[PDB]
Design a protein around this ligand. Structure first.
Ligand SMILES: [Cl-]
Lengths: 7, 147
């Protein structure tokens, strides 16, 4: 899983 | 990388079960930072993608908006521009995303499951704190879906 970092 | 790779990159999110890929959002965003001269084209594409993608993907559509939106927003504060009226500017792009963000949010929250509905709430918090979109717009959203 290549996720989106909320930053 | 040219606009066709932006389209192709964005078209490829359809083969992702989650609809989320940080590398590709980082590709789009880097591209968005190098092609503000054609931001109007980039913007309606990512605006339209959120309207048309499948239901489980709507969070990632809003992730792409968050990623490009908050990098364009970081430019206007480093550059002190509010050209909300001038095409080809970061100020204009955010103004464009803002005029449609509620319709995008009502639809994204509506068509998500409880898990993704939660993560949209997290997004509303960051935008509320970043100043990305007008707080009144997010409040209308929060008052009807998250409360
Ligand atoms: Cl700017």
């Amino acid at each position: 899983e290549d996720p989106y970092d909320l930053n | 990388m040219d606009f066709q790779n932006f389209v192709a990159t964005l078209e490829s999110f359809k083969d992702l079960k989650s609809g989320i890929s940080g590398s590709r959002i980082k590709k789009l965003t880097t591209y968005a930072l190098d092609h503000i001269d054609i931001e109007s084209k980039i913007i309606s594409l990512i605006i339209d993608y959120s309207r048309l993608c499948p239901d489980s993907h709507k969070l990632g559509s809003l992730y792409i908006i968050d990623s490009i939106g908050r990098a364009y927003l970081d430019e206007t504060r480093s550059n002190s521009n509010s050209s909300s009226n001038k095409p080809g500017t970061c100020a204009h792009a955010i103004n464009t995303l803002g005029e449609v963000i509620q319709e995008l949010l009502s639809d994204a929250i509506a068509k998500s499951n409880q898990d993704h509905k939660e993560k949209i709430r997290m997004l509303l918090d960051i935008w509320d704190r970043s100043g990305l979109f007008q707080k009144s717009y997010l409040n209308a959203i929060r008052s009807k879906c998250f409360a």
